[PDB]
Every structure is written in structure tokens, then in C-alpha cells.
Amino acid sequence: SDRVAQLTVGNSSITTQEAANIVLAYGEWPEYCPDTDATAVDKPTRPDVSVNRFYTLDSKMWQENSTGWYWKFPDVLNKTGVFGQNAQFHYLYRSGFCLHVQCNASKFHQGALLVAVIPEFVIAGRGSNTKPNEAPHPGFTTTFPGTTGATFHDPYVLDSGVPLSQALIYPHQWINLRTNNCATVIVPYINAVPFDSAINHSNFGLIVIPVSPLKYSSGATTAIPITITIAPLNSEFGGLRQAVSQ
């Protein structure tokens, strides 16, 4: 009654036979914006089942030298499905997410993955330059990787200059290949403003990192992917206009 779960959102559903509970970030569920907190006067749109549903990215393959990957949300979804279209025609976006990560292997494999959810996840230039002129900055394709994800140059300091060991403050879970093959976190809408622009601003990144490296003795399966499936719980859109991809 624990390790077996099913998640049904929209026309999509996810089953897992090996799971460690579910994390509900900061003890809240996603929700629609209350009349008292709202500011913009126009009426938001609420597609429900056409937007809220599980989208599945490509799989990141899992090696011994892998340093770990990250994504940005909503950014990964801005080009996909009806969710990507609404976010282009509207200036004001709000919602939560349900994040699900699939990695499996066999009882002769081993490793662990740290899966975290980082609100306002800021990447950082890498260089010794102390002058804001000559100092390096990351590129747009790095800051906002898209569907293809990005990779860590320094996974230990999380590329932001902050130790990985304290990442356990964020809502997280581990994939420990002897214990569970999935990690699921349900993120509420977090932001200092009720609505925002899905295009200019990403609420939070996702992070998958090998704290303990993958090991398998020869003859077993070398190819392990990491798949990601994310659903936008409770979506709203406002400020309808023409289409802007960026």
C-alpha cells in the first residue's frame, strides 16, 4: 500500500511498482490564485485537461563520468503541446507542477541520484574576473536549456557557488537503485508575484546528480537512461495577445 503508486492527470497516467512515498513541496498543494491576492483585472483562462497532464522529455543516458543535468520550468514546456501555445499567447502565467523521474537498473547495479527542486535557480559565470565588465556570464542556451537539458561543469558547488550537501533543504528525494526506481515531487506555484511571464522567467529548476556513481560488473547492461515526466497542476493564463516565443 506504499511502494505501488499510480498517478492520473488528464489523459495521461503513470504507474510505478517501486517508489518512496511522494514529496509535497513545503507542505502545500498547487491551487488557483485567490481573489484577494490577485491584481490583474482581466479574466484568466483555465484549460484544465488540455494543459494539465504528463509531458515526457527525452531520456538522458547514464554513465560513469556523468556530472548531472538540470532543466528549467515552465521553460522546458514552452514549445510543447497546448501548454506551450498558451504560454506564448499570454503575458501572465501561473501554475504548479508534478515531477516524476524514471531510472531503473538491476539488482547487480548500484548508485544514487539526488533529485531536487530549486526555487529561483541561478546559474553562475565561471571565472576569476572581479570586474563586472570583463567578468563572464552564461549564455541564454545555458541559463534556459530547454527540452534538451544542460549539464553541470561543477556539480559539487551546483554551478551556483553553493555546496551540494546543503541541497537537502529543497524538496528532494533520492533514487537509490537498490530501493526505488522513481522520484516524485509535487511543486506548488512559488514566486514573489501571483502571475509572471513564462518566457522571461523560470520559477524553478530540476536537478539530477550522481552523488554515488553508477557501477555494474561486466556483462550487465551498460545503457541506463534517465527519463523525466512533468505535469502542470492548476494552470492559469492571462494578458492575451499575439505569439511571442522569446
Add this chain to the structure above:
Amino acid sequence: DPVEDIIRAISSATNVESAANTTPSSHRLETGRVPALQAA
């Protein structure tokens, strides 16, 4: 008695302690009622 011909503001005040609220409004399809047209 002998000679008879010998014998305000529309705007008012209201306290406003905060900016105005906004009530919900749906569409309208009908004639005769036209909030947009003004004459300055």
C-alpha cells in the same frame, strides 16, 4: 399678501480607504445597451 411675486450640489462625498475593487462581468450580446460610446 398684496404682491405675490415678492413671496445644493448634485455631487456628494464618500470615504475611500483603498483602491477600487473589481466585480466579475460576463459578455453581453444584445442591442440598446452601449457602455463604450461616449460624447465628450
